Amino acid sequence: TSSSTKKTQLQLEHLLLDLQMILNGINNYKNPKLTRMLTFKFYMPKKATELKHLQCLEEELKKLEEVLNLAQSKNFHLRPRDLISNINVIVLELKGSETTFMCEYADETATIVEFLNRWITFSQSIISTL
């Protein structure tokens, strides 16, 4: 692979790992607020096959932050503000130069777990196809 491909694969892995960390940290037998967190409704991408589709993740990060404020502080090195800001920086760069592309959402909302599963899968998939 090229150097550009490799650094994109690296940004995507860093994105992956932070999304993974959030999901593991909230979705476990020990989190007494998981039930409450699952009541929130995340918008989902209609299609997520290309880096520009990360726009759909970006637009949900404020919501993600709000839900993460219910999590166990002890499960995260960073405060949710700082973790989400890091994800935001990576997403902004990975999605590419913003055209007239606002992203297209599915009608069905999803729990935080479904939402994070979608984006982790998306990231794993794109790494594999670069």
Author numbering: 23 to 152
What does the original paper state about this entry?
The IL-2 compound with residue Pro65 replaced with AzK and pegylated with a 30 kDa mPEG, hereafter referred to as THOR-707, exhibited higher expression levels of the precursor protein and was selected for further characterization. The proline residue at position 65 in human IL-2 appears to impart a significant bend in helix H3, a region that mediates substantial interactions with IL-2 Rα14,15. As the sequence of THOR-707 contains a substitution of this proline to a lysine-like residue, we reasoned that this modification might result in a distinct helical conformation that mis-aligns residues critical for IL-2 Rα engagement. To elucidate the tertiary structure of the THOR-707 protein component, the crystal structure of the human IL-2 variant P65K was solved at 1.8 Å resolution. The lysine residue incorporated at position 65 was selected to mimic the effect of the AzK substitution of this position on protein structure, as lysine constitutes the majority of the backbone of the AzK residue without the excessive hydrophobicity of the un-conjugated azide. Surprisingly, the structure of the IL-2 P65K was remarkably similar to that of rhIL-2. Structural alignments show that the lysine substitution for proline at position 65 did not result in large-scale changes to the IL-2 tertiary structure, including the conformation of helix H3. Consistent with the above biochemical and ex vivo data, an inspection of the P65K region in the structure shows that this modification occupies a region of the IL-2/IL-2 Rα interface that mediates productive interactions. The similar stepwise and minor reductions in potency of PEG size variants in both CD8+ T cells and Tregs suggest that PEG polymers are not specifically required to prevent IL-2 Rα engagement, but may impact potency in THOR-707 via non-specific envelopment as observed with other pegylated cytokines. Together, these results suggest that steric effects mediated largely by the substitution of proline 65 with AzK result in the reduction in IL-2 Rα engagement by THOR-707.
IL-2 functions as a lymphocyte growth and stimulatory factor, signaling via activation of the heterodimeric IL-2 receptor complex consisting of two subunits, IL-2 receptor β (CD122) and the common γ receptor subunit (CD132), or the heterotrimeric IL-2 receptor complex that includes IL-2 Rα (CD25). IL-2 activation of the IL-2 Rβγ complex induces proliferative and activation signals through STAT5 phosphorylation that drive effector T and natural killer (NK) cell expansion and tumor clearance. In addition to the IL-2 Rβ and γ subunits, certain cell types express the IL-2 Rα subunit, which functions to increase affinity and capture of IL-2 by the signaling complex. Structures of the IL-2/heterotrimeric receptor signaling complex demonstrated that the IL-2 Rα and βγ subunits engage IL-2 from opposite sides and that the α subunit engages IL-2 independently of the IL-2R βγ interfaces.
